[PDB]
RNA sequence: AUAUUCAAACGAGAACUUUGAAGGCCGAAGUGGAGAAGGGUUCCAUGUGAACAGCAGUUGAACAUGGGUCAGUCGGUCCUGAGAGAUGGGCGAGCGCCGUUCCGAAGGGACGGGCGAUGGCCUCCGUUGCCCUCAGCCGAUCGAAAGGGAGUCGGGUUCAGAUCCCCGAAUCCGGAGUGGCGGAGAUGGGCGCCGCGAGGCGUCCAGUGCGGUAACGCGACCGAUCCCGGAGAAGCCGGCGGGAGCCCCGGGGAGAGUUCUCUUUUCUUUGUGAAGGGCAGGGCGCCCUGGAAUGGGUUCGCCCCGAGAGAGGGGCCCGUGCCUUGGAAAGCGUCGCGGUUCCGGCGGCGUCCGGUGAGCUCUCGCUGGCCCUUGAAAAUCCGGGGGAGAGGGUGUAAAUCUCGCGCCGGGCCGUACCCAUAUCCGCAGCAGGUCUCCAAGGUGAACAGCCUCUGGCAUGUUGGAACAAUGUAGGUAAGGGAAGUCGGCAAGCCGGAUCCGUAACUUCGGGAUAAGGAUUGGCUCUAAGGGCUGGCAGCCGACUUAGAACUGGUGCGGACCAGGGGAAUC
């Protein structure tokens, strides 16, 4: 079989010297210089341990390139929080200030009261 | 490279300024007619050679044509 | 690594600017993330609050107190210690606590300390059985392990 | 050479005994084995149960059957799934006419009520 | 079938380390590697992550508990006492 | 550390140079192909044979003449790590030392407004000095050619250089008064009229984009100080699955080898890059309907479910696989012409169809286990929350745009060769030492040993003739079997796999391959173990196991690989 060697001055099968075997018009077999995965990002929420939908994974520099509509979803805190979680933030939002009106309503009776 | 799938796009592409030249391969069940810019290279294919021809007179007049085999 | 009793990133905000402090505390038993924890000189009595010592009846059990108003917390903050309240001494502002070692010292009432025990107690329970353990202990702290006679 | 001597080995020549120097799990592992069995089987499960061949109910219990082992091959569970077929399919046919005896009587007791009942 | 007759968990230890050391570490073997259940949602997926921390797969809520247990002796007679002494506190 | 032989050529001179033929070795964990540290011209051609290469040399890593290392996209350059190190400060007779945020007034920046000067058709903007206003750094600086770090691939080319030269396809970053152009913003509605109508005329009003219930999608789709988050950013081991490279199988071509006899035979070969577009194929702890015990689903193992399973219908991520632009023009294999030449010359023809596998290597993914072990930081980039502000008054639209195409530029240093039984260190061409990448066929459990193909070499600083003693390294010995010796030292016995069988003692885990038995070759069969298509029929298969007959001078783990055992004491 073709056995075969490096193209570059690095030796060692270290992160950044990662490969892959292709064949060439002129039919023969070289190695080819990978790039590394990307991973698409974390929910700011914290709790959630799936990655983001909608989003590119690609490696940090190259999201210059990439668009704003490929880089986020469309909705409140698009690209940066999960829906769950938005709806969620939603939710509890309103039933705090709404239960806040209901304490102050209370306490501003019983001062009346009093 | 991209590949043109029209003709009258294709048309507009070749009277672009930067068009320095196109060529034309004549081989089996196809034409290409390929368009060299600044930064792409647009291809044409099609699969009769009576609009080849047509296409062949319908070509800029300006534009360096070149047929190669 | 190196420490026993895991360790809490509590996040408040800072009352003088729009910002957000983060700190890392010394983790009491039963403390969950999402918990609400309040420091302050009012914060009622609760497993994870901390306040100052000079306001808790006697008897209650202290982890990570503070030797010296301001040190933020010297005493008792091993894996599984606490400290006890005995006694106050409304003059003079001092109170009389029990450390882990069962020396009963005397400190000033204005310095804050957290509420409960500190968390993963019992680890020295199970025997290390090779010096393999032993290694991966010790590589964590200092080069001290392998003591010649 | 070595094509005609692998013919003969897939003919099963000079495989004996006295050729082997591995252990009989070297050379064909016993977990292989069994995953290419499971397979197998949960696949034959899984075909009859979307052909309504068996139910559900049954489906789960020799499946469990299956992963606890009692079914060798292929064939045999299958005869044991037409022999299950065959006795549930004899129960429920004598339950069908004993509860059509039970409903006729039923109704039957109901229509003399009902006719004393319109007679008085 | 029951594999061992009186080593358990410890079986992987072999012939090494004595009786008495194997027989007192077993159990906290088996206390550490048992799956517990969450208080928050019910179900038995409380896992120890490392000493003194304990997490739940389906809530991710982690909760600081003791090194080889859930939740120890001394926790819980603690948090008694926490809360007798805030009720009279307050009376 | 197994090994040479025949003939010819040059030459004054050949055991050693070269060419051809033969016989061999390394045997893909190499005597092969390439790098790191280190060497520094040893690399290439010609010439010589004074000296050196422990014989000789027509040879050389020798000597003398001349040549040779080409980058925006390989790396340094940049970041920080363990750590080193100034200023302030302290100490010190003193050269100086400690110290790295600690006893410092440690910011020379800016959204924006005003003031005063200037150039450009002083329009509006830019360069500006001051005032007003806003503003934290973990401490200057150094620290990795294996860590982090956007961006180049295919073919050809020399004597010696090629991701560097040539040809052709790309690509990243930075710049732009008049924005170079197009597109987006964005061009609608109401009312009153004329006009048969279409449409047009004239007033008012809106216009910082749309679709999907939803996950989310569409070519953009304003916005500062400030704040939040993400990527960078990570352990080891096990199992399984997908995809590539290689190996294997059945054919079809082209060219070779054998053809005393046979072989539709044996061997070689039988391409498509990066970058875009679409689609298979994987994964989802993503969405909707709906509501489940006679519990169901499901993995090799697990596991999942009223905090919503099964069943349907959807969305997202990867996509190194296929097709397509690149692309047949090029490359390769064959047959044949031209230049006697000096040729990226010319020509035909082909570069095809399928199947497989607990196969080996790489990579992606799911999932588990172990830790009193929890398995980097920074530069850099990005999204979101907010709404300080800006843009036009209906038009010739404006502010603005991470959309498409277009124009310009990418400076400095390294780049040859050796990489090791001859270019490195050990005084040397020294059996020593020195960090890695790729890895064919058979046998076999196997990266074991043994033989072979691609590639490489000439037996390790000499040749010839004999076959004494004594040596060094191997063997074999009748009968006895440790009687030798301080002592079974040395040598020898056993050895793989399958089927039986297995004690004392014990920390119940072991002991254990205890100990002790039988079998194993070749050939011809039998049975069992599955997928696809429409309890049955047809079609495809791939390796194992068990049994039986026959047969050889009882021979069969036939070479290689390959446990002597037991009873006790310290
Ligand atoms: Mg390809
Ligand atoms: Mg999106
Ligand atoms: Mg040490
Ligand atoms: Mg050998
Ligand atoms: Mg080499
Ligand atoms: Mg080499
Ligand atoms: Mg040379
Ligand atoms: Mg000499
Ligand atoms: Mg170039
Ligand atoms: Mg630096
Ligand atoms: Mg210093
Ligand atoms: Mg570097
Ligand atoms: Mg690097
Ligand atoms: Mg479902
Ligand atoms: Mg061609
Ligand atoms: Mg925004
Ligand atoms: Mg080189
Ligand atoms: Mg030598
Ligand atoms: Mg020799
Ligand atoms: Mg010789
Ligand atoms: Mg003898
Ligand atoms: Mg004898
Ligand atoms: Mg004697
Ligand atoms: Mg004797
Ligand atoms: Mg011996
Ligand atoms: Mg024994
Ligand atoms: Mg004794
Ligand atoms: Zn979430
Ligand atoms: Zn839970």
Not at chain 1, 24 to 46: D, E, F, M, Q
Not at chain 3, 30 to 43: P, S
Not at chain 3, 63 to 84: F, H, I, Q, V
Request: glycine content about 8%.
């Amino acid at each position: 079989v073709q056995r075969l060697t490096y193209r570059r001055r690095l030796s060692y099968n270290t992160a950044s010297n990662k490969t892959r075997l292709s064949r060439t018009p002129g039919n023969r077999i070289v190695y080819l210089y990978t790039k590394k995965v990307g991973k698409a990002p974390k929910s700011a929420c914290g709790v959630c341990p799936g990655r983001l939908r909608g989003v590119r994974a690609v490696r940090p520099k190259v999201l210059m390139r990439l668009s704003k509509t490929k880089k986020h979803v469309s909705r409140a805190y698009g690209g940066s929080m999960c829906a769950k979680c938005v709806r969620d933030r939603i939710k509890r939002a309103f039933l705090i200030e709404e239960q806040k009106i209901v304490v102050k309503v209370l306490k501003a009776q019983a001062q009346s009261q009093k | 490279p991209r590949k043109i799938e029209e003709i009258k796009d294709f048309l507009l592409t070749a009277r672009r300024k930067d068009a320095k030249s196109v060529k034309i391969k004549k081989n089996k069940d196809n034409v290409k007619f390929k368009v060299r810019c600044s930064r792409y290279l647009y291809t044409l294919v099609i699969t009769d050679k009576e609009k080849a021809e047509k296409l062949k007179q319908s070509l800029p007049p300006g534009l360096a044509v070149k047929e190669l085999k | 690594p190196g420490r026993g009793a895991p360790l809490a990133k509590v996040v408040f905000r800072d009352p003088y600017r729009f910002k957000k402090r983060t700190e890392l505390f010394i983790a009491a038993e039963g403390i969950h993330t999402g918990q609400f924890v309040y420091c302050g000189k009012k914060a009622q009595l609760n497993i994870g609050n901390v306040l100052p010592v000079g306001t808790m009846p006697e008897g209650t059990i202290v982890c990570c107190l503070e030797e010296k108003p301001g040190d933020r917390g010297k005493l008792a903050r091993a894996s599984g210690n606490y400290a006890t309240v005995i006694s106050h001494n409304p003059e003079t502002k001092k109170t009389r606590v029990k450390l882990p070692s069962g020396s009963k010292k005397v400190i000033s009432s204005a310095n804050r300390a957290v509420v409960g025990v500190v968390a993963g107690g019992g680890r020295i329970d199970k025997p290390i059985l090779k010096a393999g353990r032993a290694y991966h202990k010790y590589k964590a702290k200092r080069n001290c392990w392998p003591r010649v006679r | 050479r070595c094509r005609k001597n692998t013919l003969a080995r897939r003919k099963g020549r000079h495989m004996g005994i006295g050729k082997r120097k591995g252990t009989a799990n070297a050379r064909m592992p016993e977990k292989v084995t069994w995953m290419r069995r499971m397979r197998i089987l949960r696949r034959l499960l899984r075909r009859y149960r979307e052909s309504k061949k068996i139910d559900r109910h049954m489906y789960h219990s020799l499946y469990l059957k299956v992963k606890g082992n009692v079914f060798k091959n292929k064939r045999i569970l299958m005869e044991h799934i037409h022999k299950l077929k065959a006795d549930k399919a004899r129960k429920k046919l004598l339950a069908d006419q004993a509860e059509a005896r039970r409903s006729k009587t039923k109704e039957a007791r109901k229509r003399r009520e009902e006719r004393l009942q319109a007679k008085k | 079938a029951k594999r061992t007759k009186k080593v358990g968990i410890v079986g992987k230890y072999g012939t090494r380390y004595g009786a008495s050391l194997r027989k007192m570490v077993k159990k906290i073997e088996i206390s550490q590697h048992a799956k517990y259940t969450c208080s928050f949602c019910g179900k038995t997926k409380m896992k120890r992550r490392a000493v003194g921390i304990w997490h739940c797969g389906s809530c991710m809520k982690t909760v600081a508990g003791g090194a080889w247990t859930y939740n120890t002796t001394s926790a819980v007679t603690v948090k008694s006492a926490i809360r007798r002494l805030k009720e009279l506190k307050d009376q």
